[PDB]
Write a protein that binds this ligand. Structure first.
Ligand code: MA4
Ligand code: MXF
Length: 265
C-alpha cells in the first residue's frame, strides 16, 4: 500500500467523492493523519455511539438505569429493526437498546434511545456540554441518513467526531463502568466487526461502528492497534460518490491497509 495520505487521495480519485479522515492516539489525542478533518460529513449510524454516550451520562447521574425496561408498539418501529421487532411483547432494557443500536444497527432501538435523551436537540445539547461545538443531530432514524449535498443536518467533522469519541471513552466525563460499557458495545459489533477481524493481520485490535447513507455516504468510527490494544481512533467518512457499496468498502479497507503497513509515524 501507499502512505495513508496518498491512499486517501487515490480513494477520492477512484470514487469521485470526498473522503474525511482522522487518525488519533486514543490515550493522548495526538493527531497523526488529518484529511478534510474540518469538513462536514453525514454521521449516519455512527451517531449511535454518541447517543449511547449521552445515555450512559444519564445513568452516571442517576437519571437512567441500563436495567430499565422500555415497552413500545409496532407503530413505533422504523425501517430496520432486527432486534427491536422481536420484543413487541416483552420490551427491551435501555442497555439492550444500546447493544441493539450499536452492534446490530437497529434503527428503532436508536430512536427509542433518542427519545430518552431529548431527541436530536437533546443529543446536540449534550454534545455542546462536552465541548463539541460542531457535531449536530437534527433528525431521527432513518431520515438522518439522507446525505443531501451541502446540507448541514446530521453532520460531524472527522476532527470533531474523533475528539468526542476520545472524550466519551477516556476523559472521565463518564464513570469507569460507563467508559468500559461504551467500549464493549463497539467491540461487540455483529456485522462489520467480525468481517474486519477476518481480514486484519493477527494481533490487530478492532472495535467499530459503521454507517451508510444516500449519495454514496459511508463511514466508520473505529479503535485500531497492534499488540491487541486500542491504540488509535480512526474516523473515516465518504460522501458524494456514485460508487457501489462494495467499492466504497474496498476504499475504506484500502485506507486501513495503508495505516497498517505504515503504522509507526
Ligand atoms: O505487513 C503488515 C501486514 O500486511 C498484510 O496485511 C494486509 C491484510 O492481509 C489485508 O487483509 C489488510 O486489509 C485491510 C483491512 C482493513 C479493513 C478495515 C480496517 C478498518 C480499521 C479502522 C479504519 C478503517 C477500517 O491489509 C493488511 C495490510 O496491508 C499481510 O497480510 C500481513 O501478514 C502483515 O502482517
Ligand atoms: C448504519 O448502521 C447504517 C446506516 C445505513 C443506511 C443504509 C443501509 C444500511 N445502513 C446501516 N447499517 C449497515 C452499515 O454498513 O452500517 C449494516 C451494519 C450492514 O449493512 C450491510 O451489510 N448491508 C445493508 C445494505 N446497505 S446493517 O446490518 O444494514
Amino acid at each position: 500500500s501507499p502512505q495513508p495520505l496518498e491512499q486517501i487521495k487515490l480513494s477520492e480519485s477512484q470514487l469521485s467523492g470526498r473522503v474525511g479522515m482522522i487518525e488519533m492516539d486514543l490515550a493522548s489525542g495526538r493527531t497523526l493523519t488529518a484529511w478534510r478533518a474540518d469538513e462536514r460529513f453525514p454521521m449516519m449510524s455512527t451517531f449511535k455511539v454518541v447517543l449511547c454516550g449521552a445515555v450512559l451520562a444519564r445513568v452516571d447521574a442517576g437519571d437512567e438505569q441500563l436495567e430499565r425496561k422500555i415497552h413500545y408498539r409496532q407503530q413505533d418501529l422504523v425501517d430496520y429493526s432486527p432486534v427491536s421487532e422481536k420484543h413487541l411483547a416483552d420490551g427491551m432494557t435501555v442497555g439492550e437498546l444500546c447493544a441493539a443500536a450499536i452492534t446490530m444497527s437497529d434503527n428503532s432501538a436508536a430512536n427509542l434511545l433518542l427519545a430518552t435523551v431529548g431527541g436530536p436537540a437533546g443529543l446536540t445539547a449534550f454534545l455542546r456540554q462536552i465541548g463539541d461545538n460542531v457535531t449536530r443531530l437534527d433528525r431521527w432514524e432513518t431520515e438522518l441518513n439522507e446525505a443531501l449535498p451541502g446540507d448541514a443536518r446530521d453532520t460531524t467533522t472527522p476532527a470533531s467526531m474523533a475528539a468526542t469519541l476520545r472524550k466519551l471513552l477516556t476523559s472521565q466525563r463518564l464513570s469507569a463502568r460507563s467508559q468500559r460499557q461504551l467500549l464493549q458495545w463497539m467491540v461487540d459489533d455483529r456485522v462489520a466487526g467480525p468481517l474486519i477481524r477476518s481480514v486484519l493481520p493477527a494481533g490487530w485490535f478492532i472495535a467499530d461502528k459503521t454507517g451508510a447513507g444516500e449519495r454514496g455516504a459511508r463511514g466508520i468510527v473505529a479503535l485500531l492497534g497492534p499488540n491487541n490494544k486500542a491504540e488509535r481512533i480512526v474516523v473515516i467518512y465518504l460522501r458524494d460518490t456514485p460508487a457501489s457499496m462494495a467499492e466504497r468498502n474496498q476504499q475504506i479497507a484500502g485506507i486501513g491497509a495503508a495505516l497498517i503497513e505504515h503504522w509507526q509515524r
